[PDB]
Structure 1
Amino acid sequence: SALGKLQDVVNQNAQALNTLVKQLSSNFGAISSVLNDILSRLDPPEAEV
């Protein structure tokens, strides 16, 4: 634990990036979290929503 100060910065940056990539898997109330699924499954009037 000698170099903990640098390790905390590296861990925080990696954790922020990891959480940012984890946010792509959430649909946020939509039918799916994948854009390609929405483009392939729906007409534009519901796809825009």
Structure 2
Amino acid sequence: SALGKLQDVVNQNAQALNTLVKQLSSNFGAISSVLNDILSRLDKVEAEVQ
């Protein structure tokens, strides 16, 4: 527990980089978060909106 200042710097960079990856699973209001799922399910002019 003495080395908490270095462990904190390891943990913050790992927790930021995992949060960046989990944001790929998010919809942001799109019909799906999987990019090929949109393109397989929707007509090309609407797929560009999603």
Bin of the TM-score, shorter chain as denominator length = over 0.9
> Higher helix share goes to which structure?
1
Per-residue CA shift, 1:2-45, capped at 9, x if unaligned? 11111001100000001001101111001000101011111111
The 1-side partners of 2:11 and 2:36 are apart by 32
Question: How many residue pairs are counted as aligned between the two chains?
Answer: 49
Q: Which has the higher contact order (CA 8 A, sep 6+)?
A: 2
The 2-side partners of 1:16 and 1:36 are apart by 26
Q: Which runs of 5+ in 1 are unaligned?
A: none
Q: Which runs of 5+ in 2 are unaligned?
A: none
What is the Cα-based RMSD across aligned positions, in Å?
A: 0.6
The 1-side partners of 2:44 and 2:4 are apart by 51
Task: Return structure 1 stretches of 4+ with deviation > 6 angstroms.
Answer: none
